[PDB]
């Protein structure tokens, strides 16, 4: 249903923006068979994960020293995450280590969601 082809594009733009906490786990039904049987369940868990990443991307986490540069691709993540969210259902001293763990976690998350959209575009559409 959710126009898998457009989800594939928005998720691919997310992967590329990122290569520069919620998790999709077994019980989420985001495996290939789980997509076939209950795609609504999996895409619900993806959506909530994106919403959560949107909030982190605009917090006291990505503000403060060392300051984020305007040219940075990290500054465009909030955009691409929000588009995909509609497509489905319309920190004191070392912030540095926590920003890193969040970005590496988001690469892992977007990799799984892309497999979901690729597989549903090839089997569910």
């Amino acid at each position: 249903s959710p126009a898998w082809t457009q989800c594939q594009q928005l998720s691919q733009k997310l992967c590329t923006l990122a290569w520069s906490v919620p998790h999709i786990q077994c019980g989420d039904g985001c495996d290939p068979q789980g997509l076939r049987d209950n795609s609504q369940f999996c895409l619900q868990r993806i959506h909530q994960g994106l919403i959560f990443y949107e909030k982190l991307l605009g917090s006291d986490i990505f503000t403060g020293e060392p300051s984020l540069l305007p040219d940075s691709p990290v500054g465009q993540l909030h955009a691409s995450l929000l588009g995909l969210s509609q497509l489905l259902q319309p920190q004191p001293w070392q912030r540095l280590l926590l920003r890193f763990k969040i970005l590496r976690s988001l690469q892992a998350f977007v990799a799984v969601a892309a497999r979901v959209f690729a597989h549903g575009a090839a089997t569910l559409s």
Binding site: S20, E65, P66, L69, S72, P73, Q94, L96
Partner: peptide, 18 residues
């Protein structure tokens, strides 16, 4: 703390102001 390049790389640390 620009020595982060030795912990996360020169690409990641180039995202921030030093």
């Amino acid at each position: 703390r620009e020595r982060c390049v030795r912990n996360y790389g020169h690409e990641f640390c180039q995202n921030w102001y030093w």
